Amino acid sequence: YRIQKELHNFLNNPPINCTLDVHPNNIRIWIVKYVGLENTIYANEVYKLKIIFPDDYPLKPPIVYFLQKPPKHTHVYSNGDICLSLLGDDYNPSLSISGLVLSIISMLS
Template sequence: MTAKRLQKELLALQNDPPPGMTLNEKSVQNTITQWIVDMEGATGTLYEGEKFQLLFKFSSRYPFDSPQVMFTGENIPVHPHVYSNGHICLSILTEDWSPALSVQSVCLSIISMLSSCKEKRRPPDNSFYVRTCNKNPKKTKWWYHGGTTRWRLTTAFPPSGSWMHALVGCYIENKNK
């Protein structure tokens, strides 16, 4: 089922990509389970004219399991929900994922997230998170709660954990066990 679904989504992305997005054809020449999508910041936004790349990795459980999605390359957008290592704090990439979603819907959500940004800045916990996180953003447990962020690292604190201070963004728990 995974290969059939990916083939269908690949054709959809090639034939009708979201605005400002194009599939990097070289990325799918050897494998269908890893794609690079080239992205350009939308006109009239803080990211207008900037170019980014999104890396999509699909497990054998796709579409029941969300894809691993992160920014890659030399230009990672400076955004309150994008860490400098490319990890993206976006609920549809984790707990709000549904098999009804697609690569196109993820792309649209990311372009919408960037387009609605009012100030270019990193998440407040960027330095700490980037130093301590797993390379795979799916190994991070994100909690989304209003405009408040609390994070707990199970590797840095006792098993019971200790809540640190409030930050803006989303809850994260590092699963580097």
């Protein structure tokens, strides 16, 4: 139910330079494509973010990581995992997925 609300929000208000795909056989998995913003070190490079909604979503945060190859960044591990407080300790269950992705893009930029 909350996933459908987020889907509307994301499609209607997608983060800058992002487009959405969803898994055809799993309503709980999204793949976000980000094209690196001009005037940042990732300009024109394509990165893909996998988003998994756990069974306890939204009280439990979505799991979010970059597909291979991930952007080279201090807060992105070789396996694409992301070190970001909003996804962990500072998670608020009212966070929109669109805003989560925009915060990642901000972190990268």
